[PDB]
Structure 1
Amino acid sequence: AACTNQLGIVKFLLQNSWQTADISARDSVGNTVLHALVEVADNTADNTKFVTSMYNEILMLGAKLHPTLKLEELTNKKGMTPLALAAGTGKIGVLAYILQREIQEPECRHLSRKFTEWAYGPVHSSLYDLSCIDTCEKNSVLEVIAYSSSETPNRHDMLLVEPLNRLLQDKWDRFVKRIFYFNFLVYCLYMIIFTMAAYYRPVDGLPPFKMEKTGDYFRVTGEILSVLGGVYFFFRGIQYFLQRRPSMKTLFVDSYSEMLFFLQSLFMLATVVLYFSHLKEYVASMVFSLALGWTNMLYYTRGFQQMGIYAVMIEKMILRDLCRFMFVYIVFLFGFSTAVVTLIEDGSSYNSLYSTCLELFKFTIGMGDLEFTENYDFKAVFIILLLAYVILTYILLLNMLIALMGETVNKIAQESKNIWKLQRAITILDTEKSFLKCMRKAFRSGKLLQVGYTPDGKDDYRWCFRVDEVNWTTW
Structure 2
Amino acid sequence: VFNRPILFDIVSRGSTADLDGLLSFLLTHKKRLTDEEFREPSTGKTCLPKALLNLSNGRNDTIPVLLDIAERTGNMREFINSPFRDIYYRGQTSLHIAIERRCKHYVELLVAQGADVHAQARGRFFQPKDEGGYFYFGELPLSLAACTNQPHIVNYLTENPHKKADMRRQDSRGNTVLHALVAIADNTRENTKFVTKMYDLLLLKCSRLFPDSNLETVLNNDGLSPLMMAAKTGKIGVFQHIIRREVTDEDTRHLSRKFKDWAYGPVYSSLYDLSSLDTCGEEVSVLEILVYNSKIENRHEMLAVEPINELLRDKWRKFGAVSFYINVVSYLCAMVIFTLTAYYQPLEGTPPYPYRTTVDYLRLAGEVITLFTGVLFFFTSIKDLFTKKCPGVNSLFVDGSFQLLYFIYSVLVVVSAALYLAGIEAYLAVMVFALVLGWMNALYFTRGLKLTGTYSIMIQKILFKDLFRFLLVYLLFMIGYASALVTLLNPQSNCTVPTYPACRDSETFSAFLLDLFKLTIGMGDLEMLSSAKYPVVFILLLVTYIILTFVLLLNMLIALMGETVGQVSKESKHIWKLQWATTILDIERSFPVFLRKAFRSGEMVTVGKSSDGTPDRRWCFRVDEVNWS
Retained in 2: the 8 A contact 1:135–1:143? no
Tell me what 1:416 maps to. 572
Offset of residue 259 of structure 1:
1.4
SS in 2 for 1:112: coil
State the match for 1:405 in structure 2: 561
DSSP 3-state at the match of 2:318: helix
Match of 2:351 in 1: 208
* SS of equivalent residue, structure 1 residue 126: strand
- Aligned residues of 2:609 and 2:618 also touching (Cα < 8 A): no
**Aligned pairs for 1:145-184 within 5 A:** 145-148=290-293, 150-184=294-328
8 Å CA contact 1:24–1:32 kept in 2: the answer is: yes
Q: 2:465 aligns with which of 313, 320, 324?
A: 320
Counterpart contact for 2:608–2:617, Cα < 8 Å: no
Which amino acid is 2:582 matched to? I
Q: Which residue pairs with 2:474 in the alignment? A: 329
Match of 1:285 in 2: 430
Question: CA 1:78 to 1:430, structure 2 compared with 1: closer, same or farther past 3 Å?
Answer: same
Return the match for 2:416 from 271, 283, 287.
Answer: 271
- Alignment partner of 1:113 is 2:257: yes
Amino acid across the alignment from 2:268: H
CA contact (8 A) 1:447 1:463 kept: yes
Q: Does structure 2 retain, via aligned residues, the 8 Å contact 1:272–1:282?
A: no
Moved more, 255-264 or 214-223: 214-223
Kept after mapping to 2: 8 A contact 1:135/1:142: no
What is the distance in 1 between the residues matched to 2:248 and 2:347?
Answer: 78
CA distance in 2, matches of 1:432, 1:147: 13
CA 1:323–1:84 in 2, change beyond 3 Å: closer, same or farther?
same
Which of 501, 506, 511 lines up with 1:353 in the alignment? 511
**Percentage identity across aligned positions?**
48
Aligned partners of 1:343 and 1:377 also within 8 Å = no
Question: Matches of 1:373 and 1:329 in 2, distance apart?
Answer: 27
CA contact (8 A) 1:340 1:356 kept: no
**Matches of residues 47-446 of structure 1 in structure 2 within 5 Å?**
47-136=191-280, 137-148=282-293, 150-204=294-348, 207-209=350-352, 211=354, 214=357, 215-244=359-388, 251=397, 255-307=400-452, 309-345=454-490, 348-349=497-498, 352-353=510-511, 356-357=514-515, 360=518, 367-371=523-527, 378=534, 380-436=536-592, 440-446=594-600
* 1:38 counterpart = 2:182: yes
Equivalent pairs counted in the alignment come to 464
Deviation at residue 306 of structure 1 after TM alignment: 0.7
Corresponding residue to 2:627 among 468, 471, 474: 471
Shift of 1:269: 2.9
* SS at 1:128 equivalent: strand
C-alpha contact (below 8 Å) 1:329/1:393 kept by paired residues: no
Q: Distance in 2 between matches of 1:78 and 1:314?
A: 35
* 1:300/1:454 CA distance change after superposition, 3 Å: closer
C-alpha displacement of 1:124: 1.6
- Secondary structure of 2:603's counterpart equals strand
CA distance, structure 2, for counterparts of residue 34 and residue 247 of structure 1? 21
CA distance in 2, matches of 1:248, 1:384: 58
TM (norm. structure 1) is: 0.86
What is the CA-CA distance between 1:177 and the residue it aligns to?
A: 1.0
Check 1:212–1:62 CA distance in 2 against 1; reply closer, same or farther (3 A cut). closer
1:95 aligned counterpart, secondary structure: helix
Whether contact under 8 Å (1:332, 1:393) holds in the other structure is no
Q: Unpaired runs of 5+ in structure 1? A: none
Q: Deviations over 1:176-233 (max 9, x none)?
A: 21111111111111111111122233444x5434637844443343233333333333
SS for the counterpart of 1:467 is strand
Aligned partners of 1:386 and 1:193: how far apart in 2?
50
- Residues 207 and 80 of structure 1, relative CA distance in 2, 3 Å threshold: same
Moved more, 345-354 or 170-179: 345-354
Question: For the Cα contact (< 8 Å) 1:96–1:161, is it kept in 2?
Answer: yes
Q: 1:376 to 1:301 in 2, by over 3 A?
A: farther
d(CA) in 1 for partners of 2:426, 2:317: 46
User: Residues 447 and 277 (structure 1 numbering): CA distance in 2 closer, same or farther, change over 3 Å?
Assistant: same
Q: Is the 8 A contact 1:359 1:369 kept in 2?
A: no
Q: Per-residue deviation at 1:450? A: 5.4
Measure, in 2, the Cα distance between the counterparts of 1:246 and 1:291: 34
Cα deviations across residues 30-59 of structure 1 (Å, max 9, x unaligned)?
221111112222334432222212111111
Instruction: Tell me: CA distance 1:285–1:141, structure 2 relative to 1, closer, same or farther (3 Å).
Output: same
Instruction: Report the residue type matching 1:336 in the other structure.
Output: Y
Range that drifts further, 331-340 or 348-357: 348-357
Report SS of the residue matched to 2:622: strand
**Aligned position for 2:172:** 28
Deviations 1:320-341 (A, max 9, x none): 3532332232222222232233
Deviations 1:410-464 (A, max 9, x none): 2242332222322222222222222246xx43111122225863799xx964221
Is the partner of 1:12 in helix, strand or coil? Answer: helix
Does 384-393 or 53-62 show the bigger shift? 384-393
Change (3 A) 1:42 1:327: farther
State the distance in 1 between where 2:365 and 2:537 align.
60
1:299 CA displacement? 2.6
Give the C-alpha shift of residue 13 in structure 1.
0.6
Q: Deviations over 1:260-307 (max 9, x none)?
A: 222222332333344344433234312221112112112320122411
Assess, with a 3 A threshold, how the Cα gap between structure 1 residues 3 and 173 changes in structure 2: closer, same or farther: same
Mapped contact 2:443–2:455 kept (Cα < 8 A): no
CA distance in 1, matches of 2:580, 2:174: 35
Paired amino acid for 1:353: A
> Does the 8 Å CA contact 1:115/1:128 hold for their aligned counterparts?
yes
CA distance in 1, matches of 2:327, 2:178: 43
CA 1:416/1:281 → structure 2, altered by over 3 Å: closer, same or farther? farther
Alpha-carbon distance in 2 for matches of 1:291, 1:86: 43
**In structure 2, do the counterparts of structure 1 residues 158 and 379 end up closer, same or farther at CA, with 3 Å as the change threshold?**
farther
Q: Does 1 or 2 have the higher relative contact order (CA < 8 Å, sep 6+)?
A: 1
User: Higher helix fraction: Structure 1 or Structure 2?
Assistant: 1
Q: Call closer, same or farther: CA 1:212–1:435 in 2, change over 3 Å.
A: closer
TM superposition outliers: structure 1 runs of 4+ over 6 Å: 245-249, 372-376
Segment drifting more, 327-336 vs 185-194: 327-336
User: Counterpart of 2:624 in 1: which secondary structure?
Assistant: strand
Greater mean alpha carbon deviation, residues 462-471 or residues 378-387: 378-387
- TM-score, length of structure 2 as denominator length: 0.66
- Kept in 1, the 8 Å contact 2:245–2:258? The answer is yes
1:307-327 Cα offsets, whole Å, 9 max, x none, are 164533553454435323322
Q: What is the identity, as a one-letter code, of the residue corresponding to 2:181?
A: L
- Partner SS for 1:433: helix
Kept in 1: contact 2:231–2:286 (CA 8 A): yes
- Point out the more displaced range, 410-419 or 159-168: 410-419
Q: Give the match's secondary structure for 1:449.
A: coil
State the distance in 2 between where 1:451 and 1:300 align. 44
